[model samples]
Target: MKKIVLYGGQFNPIHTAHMIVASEVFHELQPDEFYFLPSFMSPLKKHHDFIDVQHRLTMIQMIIDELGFGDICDDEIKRGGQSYTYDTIKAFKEQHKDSELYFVIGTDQYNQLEKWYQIEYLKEMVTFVVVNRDKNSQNVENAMIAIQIPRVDISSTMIRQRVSEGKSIQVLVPKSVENYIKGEGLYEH
Candidate 1:
């Protein structure tokens, strides 16, 4: 069976720490195919300043193009509303029944599994690869795998705030993404 990994998030701007987590998990698991799944609209979080999905997709595409490690999955964006992990996993399972599916997530999300839509179903659908960003042992109660990675103290929220303040986002995101954000004039107040 082919091992497939899917990293899902809003990737609001796709910052450096995001890349770091992806890289570490991708290399460690060495899955046959890895995908970057961008949410059309995250079901849990609310962001009044959420940029257009097209711009987010473009930024993620840039990262994939430059790094050449994984491909992008726009399924959530195509679905177009309150993207739930249950729906995405169901579709993927239907398409690739023979493959072993792995879903990449952070500890923050792992702790809130009970709040997810169809939690019981999701528990059976895919093996969750919890990315332990802080390298601390989390009392994660599940049979799923956990991979510890170096913590990078950067977030999309901080990146956007910096941009809005006309502060430099240098080294926070990939150079290509930085350029694209500036070119598109994203997050400018």
Candidate 2:
């Protein structure tokens, strides 16, 4: 079976670390295609501060276009409502039953795997690719493969704050995304 890497996120605004981990995964797994799946609503947490779905989607496209990893955007966001990893995987599997599915996640997320929706089904459906959010740490418990992306002290929350504070996020996000953020007037810190 061929392989596809599923990188799911809210991507409130896409950042460099997202691309860094994706680039690393490209060299390692060499999956047939890299899928960027944005969440309309994140299921992991009860409360979140996300911008417009369209904004997140467009920013990801910008980032993917820049990375040129031959990325594909999934329909999970368009599907609407809470985004669950299991639902996304199951959908992709239906369309690509022959290809192996790999869901990329971070170390902080690794701990909550068992608590996810359809944990058993997900466990049997796809392997989890781990990215160490804290680049200083590498002790991923059940990671199929760990991507060695060094520390990028950038987070979407941080960027959103910078934007709210009227500080330049030109360094944190790509120029295109930065301009889009400013144009859209997203996040008030």
Candidate 3:
């Protein structure tokens, strides 16, 4: 059976650290494919400022093309509404019932699983890979398997702030993504 890693998020601008963490996970698990599933908008972060779905999706695709662990998936983006993790998992499980699905998430989300929508279904679906950003032992203490993914200090929020301030984002995100954002005047207010 094929194994896949589902990394669902708002890649407002796809950055290199995101890829780095993913690469570490990809190497550690050696999954058949690593999918970057870009959400239309995260249910948890619906109130935040987000770039348009197409631009986010396009940026993800650009990163995927630049670093081919797998492909860019626009499942939630096409659905055109608040993107919930449970719904995404449900549809994926329906389609790829035979394949092993691993849901990659950050430590913060892992800690808040109890509050997530349809918690029971999410826990039942994918094998969760929580990225321990703060070097905390409890990040995945209960999990049978734990992979140490050295967190990148950078964040999309920081990137956006830097962009708005006319600072350098050349190192934060991929060149292609940086160029796309600047060309389109995405974050700069």
Candidate 4:
């Protein structure tokens, strides 16, 4: 069965660490395709000075074009609601019935798995691939179904704040993304 890695994030600005993790997962996991899924809205946090969905998607496409792997998936953003994992999983399952699905998420988010919409159905649909965040937390592997990847200390929020403060985002995000943010004056709010 073909295996695909699904990574969903706000990606207010796609960062270098994001690319690194995606590369790691692509190489180590040997998935046929790696998908970068950007959300239109996240239920957990209040919307900040977020860029428009089309702009964010365009930025992601630019990053993907520069990186040369991973495809930008706009289904979630196109659907335009709460951006539920179960809904996405179901859509993919229907589209690719024979392939195995893997959902990539950060360890911090994995801890709140039970609170996700249709959590049980999500569990039944795909294997949860948890990447480590910089927070102190329990093991995501301890969950009923999860695979824990080594931790990486990086955050889009931190990167955004730094850019807003006129700080350098050289190492945090891709050079292309950094240039795009600066050129467009994004995250200034």
* TM-score top scorer: 1
Quote the positional error of residue 124 for candidate 2 in Å: 1.0
Name every residue pair that clashes in candidate 4.
none
What TM-score fits each model?
0.95, 0.91, 0.91, 0.89
Scored against the true structure, residue 117 in model 2 reaches a CA lDDT of 92
User: Model 2, range 90-159, lDDT digits (tens) per residue?
Assistant: 7778988788888888877887777789988897888888878865665654636667677777887798
RMSD of each: 1.4, 1.9, 1.8, 2.3
1-189 per-residue lDDT for model 1 (tens digits): 899999999998998888888888888999999999999888889969767778998998888886779999888888988999999999888999999999988988987888999999998888898877545554555688888777677888899899999999999998999999999999998
User: Tens digit of lDDT per residue, candidate 3, span 23-126?
Assistant: 87888899988889887777777446655677887887787787776787768877878888888889878988789888887777777888889887777777
In candidate 4, residue 164 scores what lDDT?
A: 77
Question: What's the lDDT for residue 144 in model 3?
Answer: 28
On the 0 to 100 scale, the lDDT of residue 66 in model 4 is 73
Deviation in Å, model 3, residue 20 alpha carbon:
1.0
Model 4 segments beyond 4 Å from truth? 135-151
- 90, model 3: CA deviation in Å? 1.3
After superposition, which runs of candidate 1 have C-alpha atoms over 4 Å from their true positions? 134-139
- lDDT of each candidate versus the true structure: 0.87, 0.79, 0.79, 0.77
Worst 10 residues of 2 by lDDT: 134-143
The TM-score of predicted model 4 comes to: 0.89
TM-score: model 1 vs. ground truth = 0.95
C-alpha lDDT of residue 66 in model 2 = 94
Better of 1 and 4 by TM-score: 1
